[PDB]
Design a protein around this ligand. Sequence first.
Ligand code: HEC
Ligand code: HEC
Lengths: 143, 143
Amino acid sequence: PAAAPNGISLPAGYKDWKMIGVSSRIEQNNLRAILGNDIAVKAAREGRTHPWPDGAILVKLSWKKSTHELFPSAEVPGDFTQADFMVKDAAKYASTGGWGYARWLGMEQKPYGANADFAQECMGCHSGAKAADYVFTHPAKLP
Amino acid sequence: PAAAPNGISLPAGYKDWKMIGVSSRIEQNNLRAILGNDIAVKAAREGRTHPWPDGAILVKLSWKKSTHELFPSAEVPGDFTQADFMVKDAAKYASTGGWGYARWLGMEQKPYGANADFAQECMGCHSGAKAADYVFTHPAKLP
Ligand code: HEC
Ligand code: HEC
């Protein structure tokens, strides 16, 4: 697809990345998966998040919630809504907290944002997670 | 970890597997990730699920729901509760629909089940999905 307005290209092969976590956002009626590239997954598992290392890429995949036709108390993914990315590069992206933000919308993978300054929107909320290097997600615990 | 009572060993390396989907089970207050080995992932993506191919392994990972401390409308994983597996081998597990069922509990990874017949409990619900080869999960759609 086209690059984001800030020049970030869609990372190839994100659908094959390893899982960091999952979430449900009540207020938007979605389910999400949080994946990362191998730098991000190694950092997440080792607790090297203060700060995250350069080269880490986080992706959040979002779907509308639907209910399973055979088991109504199971909320399961419906339509795909968006892919959100954060790319760590402390020098390149110093103006947005050391992260390159990007979003692509829908199955059509339309880049989000009116202009190259769109990431200030993202920062508006993510600045609340400054103490955790602008990342809300806590990696899910596994054995 | 100890093998399940039906002889199934815990698949090594499952935390490095690719994502098939995610879910939320309302009645359990759990968030879940569904991963699969590469045989399962290929089959899921290609629609070769009638029946699933031998060697496919699905894993469901479950965590208690907890709300994010910075964003209370975000439901996120808390304590890890269990890993559920289904191993396809049509001939070997013909008596349980062609799938080997197994569950390990908690971080401590205690095998579930009183005896080797424990998988009948799993079949009790999964038989409702018999027309879909005993699998409820619909692979999440991605571009
Ligand atoms: C999740 C996110 C992720 C994963 C990394 C993380 O911080 O956990 C990415 C790559 C990303 N966002 Fe943001 N986002 C918010 C919250 C609370 C969470 C965690 C809970 C969940 O799984 O949903 C996020 C909050 C917000 C927010 C507040 C209303 C805004 C405006 C944004 N996020 C905006 C953005 C982006 C702007 C286009 C962007 C690329 C994001 N988030 C990336
Ligand atoms: C999910 C499951 C998975 C993933 C494959 C699938 O069928 O989607 C595995 C490997 C597994 N179960 Fe089962 N299970 C149930 C439902 C509705 C879902 C889909 C929704 C979700 O993501 O949670 C499942 C339902 C039930 C159920 C009804 C009360 C029982 C008793 C069980 N499941 C039991 C078992 C197992 C017995 C130990 C076992 C190994 C399972 N499930 C594996």
